[PDB]
C-alpha cells in the first residue's frame, strides 16, 4: 500500500522518514548561506535576495547571535530558523545560569540537534524546514557546524546550504585543499564573500545583498560581530573582482 | 506534540470481533512453546530457549521468571512485552498487597492483577494489546497449588495442565493423556520434559530448556536463619544439570 509520507514520525518500508525529506526540499529552495572555519574562528555569510527596490538596504538582518559568541545562519523557511534560534538562546542561557561558563560550541550543537530530532518523533509536529550553519569560539578553539532537518549535524571545515550549495561546496573544497595551514579570519571573510557571489549564479535572476559575520579570537575577541563598514566593502570588491 | 491518541486502538468490528486482540493471539501462536503441569505437591512450568544465535549467552535471558517467592511465570509470544509485564507484576505484588497486608498475594489475585493490566491495553487510549499469553504457577496457604493462563484480552483460566504457543494443540493433547490427579512433582517434571521434546526442533538439553517448579519450601535459598514463620521460597528454577539428570531417565 502507500501513505507513508503523510504523517511525520512514520517509517517507510525502506526506513526513511519522508516528512523529514520533504523538509529538506524546502531548504534546497532557499537562499544559499555558508560557514567557513578558520585558524581561530568562523565566518558566516548568506545571500539575501532583493525581492524589490522597496526593501530597505541593510536592515533585514538574517544572521543571528546566540549568547555572545555563537553565530547562526540558515536556509529554508526563515521563521523556522528564528524558532530554532529562540530555542538555542533559551538553551544557552540555561547552560550559563547553572554552570557560569558560556555554552561550549559542541554542547550547543547537540542542544539544537536534540530539539530538531525531537521534531521527527511525533506526527503532531512538523520537522524544521531549515539547515542551520552555526558555531563560534570556546575554551578550546573554533567550531563550525551544520544541522539538517533530520536533526543530523556534524562539525565542518566549511559548510554550505541552499540553492547554490553545490557551487559553494565546490569552492569550499578548493579552499580546504590549497590552504591546509588554515585561513586567516580576514581571508575567510574575503573568501566567504567570494563563495557567496559565485554561488549567487545558481539564482542569477534577482539582484542580491551580502551579509557576513564572524567570531574570531583575534579580530573580534571570541565574540560574534557582524561585518560592517570598511571590512565589508573590501570583501564585496574582492568578490566582484575574482568573478571575471 | 503530546499523546493526542486518547482514543481506543482496539474497537469492535461488525462481526463482534476485537481485531487487535485476535491479532495479538496470532502473535502468541508463532511463539515458542511453553507449558505448565500441576501435580499434587507441585507445579512445573517449562519452555524452550530459542536462542536467536550461538554467540548470544542464553543464560542472560530468563523466560521463566519469579514474581514472588511462591509464584513463577513463563510465556509464549513477544518477549519484550513479557519482560515489562513481569516488572509490573513484581511491583503490583508489592503495591497492592505486600505493603498493605504484609504478605505476598495468592496466585489467583496476582493473576487477576496482571490480567487487569492486559485488559486495559485492550481499551485505554493509544495502546495496542500485549502480544503474550502467560502461564503463572504458584502456591499459597489457603489455595494450595495452581496454574493459570492469561490471554491478550485479559481473560485468565485455571488449568491442571496446558500448553501455549507453536505446538500447543499437539502438546495439550499429549498432556490430556498423561495427566491424572495422583502425580508427584517428579512425574510432572517428567511429563513436562516429554511434552516439550516433541515441540523442540533441535538440541534438547539443559542449556536449551528452562524449567521451574513451585514446590516445597527451600530454606537454603532464604539467605537468613532465625525467623520461623517464613520458611523459604517455593519457587525454584532447575539448573542445567538438574534437567540433564532427568533427561537421562527418559
Amino acid at each position: 500500500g502507500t501513505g507513508y509520507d503523510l504523517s511525520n514520525s512514520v517509517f517507510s518500508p525502506d526506513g526513511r522518514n519522508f516528512q523529514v525529506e520533504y523538509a529538506v526540499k524546502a531548504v534546497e529552495n532557499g537562499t544559499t548561506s555558508i560557514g567557513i572555519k578558520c585558524n581561530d574562528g568562523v565566518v558566516f555569510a548568506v545571500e539575501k535576495l532583493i525581492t524589490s527596490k522597496l526593501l530597505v538596504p541593510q536592515k533585514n538582518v538574517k544572521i543571528q547571535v546566540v549568547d555572545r559568541h555563537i553565530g547562526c545562519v540558515y536556509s529554508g523557511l526563515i521563521p523556522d530558523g528564528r524558532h530554532l534560534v529562540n530555542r538555542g538562546r533559551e538553551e544557552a542561557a540555561s547552560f550559563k545560569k547553572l554552570y557560569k561558563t558560556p555554552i561550549p560550541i559542541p554542547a550547543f550543537a547537540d542542544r539544537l540537534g536534540q530539539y530538531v530530532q525531537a521534531h521527527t518523533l511525533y506526527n503532531s509536529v512538523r520537522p524544521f524546514g531549515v539547515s542551520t550553519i552555526f558555531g563560534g569560539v570556546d575554551k578550546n578553539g573554533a567550531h563550525l557546524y551544520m544541522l539538517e532537518p533530520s536533526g543530523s549535524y556534524w562539525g565542518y571545515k566549511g559548510a554550505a546550504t541552499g540553492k547554490g550549495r553545490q557551487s559553494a561546496k565546490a569552492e569550499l573544497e578548493k579552499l580546504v585543499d590549497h590552504h591546509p595551514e588554515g585561513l586567516s579570519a580576514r581571508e575567510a571573510v574575503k573568501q566567504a564573500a567570494k563563495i557567496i557571489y559565485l554561488a549567487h549564479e545558481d539564482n542569477k535572476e534577482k539582484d542580491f545583498e551580502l551579509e557576513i559575520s564572524w567570531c574570531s579570537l583575534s579580530e573580534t575577541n571570541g565574540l560574534h560581530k557582524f561585518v560592517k563598514g570598511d571590512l565589508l566593502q573590501e570583501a564585496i570588491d574582492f568578490a566582484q573582482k575574482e568573478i571575471n | 506534540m503530546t499523546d493526542r491518541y486518547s482514543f481506543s486502538l482496539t474497537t469492535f468490528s461488525p462481526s463482534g470481533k476485537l481485531g487487535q486482540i485476535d491479532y495479538a493471539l496470532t502473535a502468541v501462536k508463532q511463539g515458542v512453546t511453553s507449558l505448565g503441569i500441576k501435580a499434587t505437591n507441585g507445579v512445573v512450568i517449562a519452555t524452550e530457549k530459542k536462542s536467536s544465535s550461538p554467540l548470544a549467552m542464553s543464560e542472560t535471558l530468563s523466560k521463566v521468571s519469579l514474581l514472588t517467592p511462591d509464584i513463577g511465570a513463563v510465556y509464549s509470544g513477544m518477549g519484550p512485552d513479557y519482560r515489562v509485564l513481569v516488572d509490573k507484576s513484581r511491583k503490583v505484588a508489592h503495591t497492592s498487597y505486600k505493603r498493605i497486608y504484609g504478605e505476598y498475594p495468592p496466585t489467583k489475585l496476582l493473576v487477576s492483577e496482571v490480567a487487569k493490566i492486559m485488559q486495559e491495553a485492550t481499551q485505554s487510549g493509544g495502546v495496542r494489546p500485549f502480544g503474550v499469553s502467560l502461564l503463572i504457577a504458584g502456591h499459597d496457604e489457603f489455595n494450595g497449588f495452581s496454574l493459570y493462563q492469561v490471554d491478550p484480552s485479559g481473560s485468565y483460566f485455571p488449568w491442571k495442565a496446558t500448553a501455549i504457543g507453536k505446538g500447543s494443540v499437539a502438546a495439550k493433547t499429549f498432556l490430556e493423556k498423561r495427566w491424572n490427579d495422583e502425580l508427584e512433582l517428579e512425574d510432572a517434571i517428567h511429563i513436562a520434559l516429554l511434552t516439550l521434546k516433541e515441540s523442540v526442533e533441535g538440541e534438547f538439553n539443559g542449556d536449551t530448556i528452562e524449567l521451574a517448579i513451585i514446590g516445597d519450601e527451600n530454606p537454603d535459598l532464604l539467605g537468613y536463619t532465625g525467623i520461623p514463620t517464613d520458611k523459604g521460597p517455593r519457587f525454584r528454577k532447575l539448573t542445567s544439570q538438574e534437567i540433564n539428570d532427568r533427561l537421562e531417565a527418559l
Binding site: Y4, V10, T120 | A27, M57
Partner: protein, 243 residues
C-alpha cells in the same frame, strides 16, 4: 484499518511493521561494528567512513562514552543515536545518585530496551531506528556486551557484530569460538584483543583498513575510552606481521 502499517498496532499476522521498518533504518549508515571480550576488557570496533572532504573527522563517531564505565556503539542514523546516548547518560547518572553504585551495562541495556518496548506499544511514540551495543567490564559480571534493538529485545553476547555485513562478521567470530572453545579472546592486554578484533574484521569483510577508517572503544575495570587515530595505527602496525 489499512493504517496498520503506519503506527505500532498489530497487522493481521501479528506483526508490527513499524518495528520492522525501524530495523531497516539501522542499516542506513553502511557502518559495521563488532565487539569482543578479552580476559579483563571488552573491545568494540566500528568502521569509520568520512565521505565529504569538508567534514571535521574528529566529530564523526558512533561510539559514545555513556559513563566512566559503560561505552556504547550505535548502528543507526546519528540523530537517533544521539537521542539514545543522551538518555543513557541520564539514566546512568540517576541510577548512581539513587542507588549508590555504578549502573551495570546489563541493567542500562535492560532499561534502554524497556523504553524501546514502550515505543512498540504506544502509538504516539515512533521506535528509534538504532541498535545499541553496550560494553563494559562489570564489577560482578566481568567483560560484558549487551545489545538492544528497536523491538525492545536485548541479550548479552560472547561477541557480536552489527551492520549491513553483520552475517560475515558473525560467522567469522562464530568459527573462532568453536575452534578455541572459550567464551573470550585469551589475551591479557586489551591491545591484543583490539588487534584480534581488527584482524577478524579484516578477514571477515575482506577489506584492509587505515587509521582513519576505524573507530575503537575499549572497556577495562573502572574505565571505558576511545582510541585515537595514532593508537589505532600502532594496532595496525602491529597486525601487519601475523599477516
Amino acid at each position: 484499518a489499512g493504517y496498520d502499517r503506519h503506527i505500532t498496532i498489530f497487522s493481521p499476522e501479528g506483526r508490527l511493521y513499524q518495528v520492522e521498518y525501524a530495523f531497516k533504518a539501522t542499516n542506513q549508515t553502511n557502518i559495521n561494528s563488532l565487539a569482543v571480550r578479552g580476559k579483563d576488557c571488552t573491545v568494540v570496533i566500528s568502521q569509520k567512513k568520512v565521505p565529504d572532504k569538508l567534514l571535521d573527522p574528529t566529530t564523526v563517531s558512533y561510539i559514545f562514552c555513556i559513563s566512566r564505565t559503560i561505552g556504547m556503539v550505535v548502528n543507526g542514523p546519528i540523530p537517533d543515536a544521539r537521542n539514545a546516548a543522551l538518555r543513557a547518560k541520564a539514566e546512568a547518572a540517576e541510577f548512581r545518585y539513587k542507588y549508590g553504585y555504578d549502573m551495570p551495562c546489563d541493567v542500562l541495556a535492560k532499561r534502554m530496551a524497556n523504553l524501546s518496548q514502550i515505543y512498540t506499544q504506544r502509538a504516539y511514540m515512533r521506535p528509534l531506528g538504532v541498535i545499541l551495543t553496550f560494553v563494559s567490564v562489570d564489577e560482578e559480571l566481568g567483560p560484558s556486551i549487551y545489545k538492544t534493538d528497536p523491538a525492545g529485545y536485548y541479550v548479552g553476547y560472547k561477541a557480536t557484530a552489527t551492520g549491513p555485513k553483520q552475517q560475515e562478521i558473525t560467522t567469522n567470530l562464530e568459527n573462532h569460538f568453536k575452534k578455541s572453545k572459550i567464551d573470550h579472546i585469551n589475551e591479557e592486554s586489551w591491545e591484543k584483543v583490539v588487534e584480534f578484533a581488527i584482524t577478524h574484521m579484516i578477514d571477515a569483510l575482506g577489506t584492509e583498513f587505515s587509521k582513519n577508517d576505524l573507530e575503537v572503544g575499549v572497556a577495562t575495570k573502572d574505565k571505558f575510552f576511545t582510541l585515537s587515530a595514532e593508537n589505532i595505527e600502532e594496532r595496525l602496525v602491529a597486525i601487519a606481521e601475523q599477516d
